[PDB]
């Protein structure tokens with residue numbers, strides 16, 4: 001289809017169109033990307049991702065068209081630790097994408113250690129909300145919590161300072177305009193605090209014509225829940 | 241998802257989200273539901289169907305909601321014969337539906353011969369565009385071409401006389417309003433000739449909560465091409 005849209009105002013346990021990978025599962029009408037024990041507390045060493053089952057037609061070689069897409073979602077992170085980790089990301093990848101071996105912790109379930117900073121070795125565009133930046137292990141990160149735009153590498157092409165707020169929902173709107181090739185991210189907390197970051201990228205040179213969209217999160221030695229609360233997505237092919 | 245929408249203005253050969261069954265295949269930017277020969281001519285004894293791959297949440301018991309949905313599509317029928325057969329149908333059925341054994345010809349690839357008129361044995365709602373009605377083999381049909389609403393039986397609960405026009409595209413809008421439980425069908429040719437048929441039906445008592453939607457067509461001894469040219473669909477769960 002040239003156009004596709006879907007909306008999850010909440011996530012009831014009865015799901016048919018989500019691909020669950022790793023530890024991801026539905027609990028209390030939300031998607032818990034990372035594992036929680038019986039009491040709902042976060043645990044270490046866990047990775048989980050979800051993908052929408054239908055493939056999205058991102059661009060079409062034959063017709064010179066590229067999709068205009070918008071992804072709106074909300075999530076919250078909670079941890080009793082002072083340094084909850086590692087973060088959650090909205091991502092776009094080839095349809096057969098699976099969790100790479102050893103992609104836990106700071107790799108966010110998106111990259112393999114050996115090629116995490118090798119741009120010619122990956123095909124992924126992701127928007128990360130990264131809460132762990134210890135310079136000794138997450139050497140590629142700026143030294144503070146941040147929102148980053150990742151294009152084929154865990155070392156973000158761009159980051160902006162962000163504040164992690166325990167148990168508070170962050171609403172995010174990610175949009176891509178094929179005319180300007182701008183990928184824009186706008187995130188807000190309920191008190192109006194706003195974060196914005198934009199990057200120009202030709203998706204046709206990074207991803208295949210058909211892709212799958214979803215979310216990924218992970219926790220290494222440090223941990224926190226990564227709860228996806230709602231998600232709506234729309235995409236339509238346009239002449240450029 | 242509570243809401244789902246997709247649009248196919250045309251059908252390029254590179255499809256990823258369609259389930260093809262029987263003889264259905266893409267050809268010249270359209271879906272040819274029934275088999276054609278090397279030159280594009282329709283042939284006898286063929287059945288074909290397509291279904292969109294993502295499942296539609298038609299109703300939700302826990303919340304007492306039922307979806308409002310709209311399906312718009314256009315198709316054309318062509319045949320060397322003056323009495324082409326057998327017809328095309330838009331249908332909604334359980335997700336695992338497959339072509340029933342012996343469902344060719346007048347059964348339109350939707351019902352099994354032995355239970356075609358047994359309402360307690362089927363789970364399907366279909367809107368048929370039936371061009372063949374000989375009473376020796378299609379004993380359940382009115383004696384004229386017709387559009388019909390089928391609820392668990394090949395013997396339509398409601399029909400309207402219709403005119404088959406060789407090679408002309410018919411534009412169809414099928415809508416279901418949960419507030420009134422009315423399934424409405426409006427079909428029009430480009431010159432403005434219009435046909436309408438509606439029926440009140442509680443989808444909750446006929447189909448499961450999750451379903452798949454698609455099209456089916458067949459040709460028995462008499463034949464014609466059944467070309468699906470475009471298709472758009474949208475569904476939204478509503479409390480009514």
Ligand SMILES: OC[C@H]1O[C@H](O)[C@@H](O)[C@@H](O)[C@@H]1O
Nearest residue numbers: 085105106137219220221222
């Ligand atoms: O969880 C914090 C931290 O723990 C370990 O050091 C590794 O798993 C890192 O990749 C991760 O960033």
Ligand SMILES: OC[C@H]1O[C@H](O)[C@@H](O)[C@@H](O)[C@@H]1O
Nearest residue numbers: 325345346377459460461462
């Ligand atoms: O095609 C016309 C007619 O041919 C045969 O008689 C059978 O396949 C019927 O079911 C069909 O309606």
Ligand SMILES: [Ca+2]
Nearest residue numbers: 106130132138
């Ligand atoms: Ca990090």
Ligand SMILES: [Ca+2]
Nearest residue numbers: 346370372378
């Ligand atoms: Ca018939």
Ligand SMILES: [Mn+2]
Nearest residue numbers: 130141148156
């Ligand atoms: Mn980072």
Ligand SMILES: [Mn+2]
Nearest residue numbers: 370381388396
């Ligand atoms: Mn009929």
